[PDB]
């Protein structure tokens, strides 16, 4: 059956625009597409998605997420598309995307990320589209070197389809491209 606040069609469950403060319970394990956009979800419970092993699309844009719980996506090995735009993410947990071998689209634009943890994207072998613009990247901090090295190596998949490209990943305050920062200009002491 379909969750109360949600609308279901085939393997799609849309719980969008329902003023939800949390993820609805009783979501069928056969769910391939789960829509939770445009709600008031402020936090995700650890392992809330473990049941949904068939999930290929998870939509969470326009909520109030400040961070994620560790390993929250590790059961979702079939995940293809992940939407996080317009939240308040200030940091990502180490290895949240490590299991997402088939992920082609990762959408992280318009958040509050200062940095990306080392090797966070390394396991994403299928990644076709990643959006990283509109984030206050701390270029004075030395932890940004991973993001720098990664986007300069995979620039073709960064902010494509006229979203600015790799140059639209900009530094906080100076508005300089992140790919252009030097290791000498950064420092471990300027890391919050």
């Amino acid at each position: 059956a379909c969750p109360s606040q949600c609308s279901c069609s085939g393997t799609t469950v849309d719980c969008s625009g329902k003023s939800l403060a949390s993820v609805p319970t009783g979501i069928p394990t056969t769910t391939q597409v789960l829509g939770l956009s445009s709600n008031q979800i402020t936090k995700l419970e650890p392992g809330v998605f473990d049941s949904l092993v068939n999930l290929q699309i998870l939509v969470l844009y326009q909520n109030q997420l400040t961070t994620l719980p560790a390993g929250v996506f590790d059961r979702l090995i079939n995940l293809k598309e992940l939407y996080f735009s317009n939240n308040q993410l200030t940091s990502l947990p180490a290895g949240v995307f490590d299991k997402l071998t088939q992920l082609t689209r990762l959408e992280l634009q318009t958040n509050q990320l200062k940095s990306i943890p080392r090797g966070a994207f390394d396991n994403l072998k299928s990644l076709t589209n990643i959006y990283l613009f509109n984030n206050p990247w701390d270029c004075e901090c030395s932890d940004i070197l991973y993001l720098k090295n990664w986007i300069v190596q995979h620039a073709s998949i960064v902010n494509p389809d006229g979203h600015g490209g790799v140059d639209n990943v900009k530094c906080s305050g100076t508005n300089t491209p992140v790919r252009a920062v030097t290791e000498a200009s950064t420092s471990p002491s300027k890391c919050p």
Binding site: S9, S16, Q32, Q56, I57, K80, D161, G162
Partner: protein, 443 residues
């Protein structure tokens, strides 16, 4: 560029300026967050199997031309929310005779969307969401008389001037499962308004399962006139939470608490649950709820309640649940909960309670659940719980229990004998040991 998975087509944020080519068998399509400036009849020509379609939040000014959806006889759900300055031709929804759900939240729409012929083709419509638009008056056109399964309407966050009988004429005969009129202000319907008599009964010949009127101020003088006006309307659940003008508030003179006349108009409504939480009620006056003779659940949580007068609960012969959590009762006595013989659940948590009177819970033989947690109780009178013979659950934790002997003798023994009923764990202040574990050397 869309992601196709079975019968699902995901086209979110693809920079699209028109509907893309998709396999002709898909029945769920999400085109949200693109730059489609206009939808017309050619837009969904190759998608006649559509059951669920979202075209939310295009760049401002999306235009939907006549017969855009002509041919989509399988379309059940259509979501078009967050299209700023949405432009609808009057035949925009031609052919959607089987549509059940339409959502048009935050599209800068006005009242003509209900009074004009926009929804005329929607003969199967059941649920209409019109949140956060510019609808100043609710005036459904006459074809709504023939919409036999229309039963859910959401108009939250529209600045509605007023609601009157002649406005809602074409909703008469309907039974709504949900009529959500939350935070709609009703600025004209104040205590001075000359239009009250002419207003009549907006809900004449209309029944409602859940009437949500939360966030509308509802000063006592206004509530009284409003419920006098809709007297006799069958309502099963009444929601009046966040009535920020309701109640006299903490030590004040301007506004009044409700009294025995305030809700008299709901006398014959058959109300089963009533939510008056998050308002500013200071005192419960006598017979204030005496017209809720069918009421089974009542929450008054998060008000400013300092006082419960004699016979405040007079007439509540069927009430099973009373929520008084997050108020300022400070102390409980026997008189306060008279007239609640059938009560099964009582929440007195978060009330700064420092004293329970001797016979506080005497007239509640059917009480199953009693919450007294998160107060300031150091002690209870001996025998305070002995007549609660139906009791199944009790909360006593987060209180500064004084575990000196023999003061704690009754409670420690009672909590031990009834350990299966205690939810959470009452603790001695100081030592931190469970009160249930204390054995006094004497008694």
């Amino acid at each position: 560029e869309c992601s196709v998975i079975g019968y699902n087509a995901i086209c979110i944020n693809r920079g699209l300026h028109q509907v893309p080519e998709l396999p002709a068998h898909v029945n769920y399509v999400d085109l949200s967050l693109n730059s489609i400036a206009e939808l017309n009849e050619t837009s969904f020509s190759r998608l006649q199997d559509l059951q669920f379609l979202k075209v939310e939040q295009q760049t401002p000014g999306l235009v939907i031309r006549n017969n855009t959806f002509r041919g989509l006889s399988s379309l059940i759900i259509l979501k078009l929310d967050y299209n700023q300055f949405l432009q609808l031709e009057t035949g925009a929804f031609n052919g959607l005779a089987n549509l059940e759900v339409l959502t048009l939240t935050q599209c800068n729409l006005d009242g003509a969307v209900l009074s004009g012929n926009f929804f005329k083709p929607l003969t199967s419509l059941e649920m209409l969401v019109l949140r956060d638009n510019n609808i100043k008056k609710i005036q459904p056109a006459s074809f709504f008389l023939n919409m036999r399964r229309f039963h859910v309407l959401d108009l939250t966050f529209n600045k509605v001037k007023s609601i009157c009988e002649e406005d809602l004429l074409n909703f008469q005969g309907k039974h709504f499962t949900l009529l959500r009129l939350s935070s709609i202000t009703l600025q004209d319907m104040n205590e001075y308004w000359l239009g009250w008599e002419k207003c009549g009964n907006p809900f004449k010949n209309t029944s409602i399962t859940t009437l949500d009127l939360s966030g509308n101020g509802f000063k006592e003088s206004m509530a009284k006139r409003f419920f006098d006006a809709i007297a006799g309307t069958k309502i099963q659940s009444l929601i009046l939470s966040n009535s920020y003008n309701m109640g006299s508030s903490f030590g004040h003179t301007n506004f009044k608490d409700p009294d025995n006349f305030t809700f008299k108009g709901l006398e014959a409504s058959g109300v089963k649950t009533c939510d008056l939480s998050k308002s500013k009620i200071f005192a419960l006056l006598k017979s204030v709820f005496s017209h809720f003779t069918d009421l089974e659940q009542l929450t008054l949580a998060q008000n400013e309640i300092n006082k419960i007068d004699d016979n405040a609960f007079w007439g509540l012969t069927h009430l099973l649940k009373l929520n008084l959590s997050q108020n300022f009762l400070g102390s409980i006595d026997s008189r306060m909960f008279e007239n609640l013989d059938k009560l099964e659940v009582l929440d007195l948590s978060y009330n700064h309670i420092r004293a329970l009177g001797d016979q506080s819970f005497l007239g509640l033989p059917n009480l199953k659940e009693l919450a007294l947690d998160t107060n300031q109780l150091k002690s209870v009178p001996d025998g305070i719980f002995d007549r609660l013979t139906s009791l199944q659950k009790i909360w006593l934790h987060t209180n500064p229990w004084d575990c000196s002997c023999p003061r704690i003798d009754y409670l420690s023994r009672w909590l031990n004998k009834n350990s299966q009923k205690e939810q959470g764990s009452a603790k001695c202040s100081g030592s931190g040991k469970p009160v249930r574990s204390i054995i006094c050397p004497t008694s």
